[PDB]
Design a protein around this ligand. Structure first.
Ligand SMILES: [Cu+]
Length: 68
């Protein structure tokens, strides 16, 4: 499917807010958000690639994990 975990840095909550403000702008995405483990579980018709170059605009320590 197009289920896409990214590990990120949100060592302060505002990074999750920022990430949301990023990804939301994409539109079709939805994304669950873990703060303590600093992760975004994105599930999106828009591919991991499309996600990457969007999520990248946060410029956190974003690292993409496997595709489900
Ligand atoms: Cu932060």
């Amino acid at each position: 499917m197009p289920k896409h975990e990214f590990s990120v840095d949100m060592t302060c909550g505002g990074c999750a807010e920022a990430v949301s403000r990023v990804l939301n702008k994409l539109g079709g995405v939805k994304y669950d958000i873990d703060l303590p483990n600093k992760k975004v579980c994105i599930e999106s018709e828009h591919s991991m690639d499309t996600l990457l170059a969007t999520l990248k605009k946060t410029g956190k320590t974003v690292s993409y994990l496997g595709l489900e």
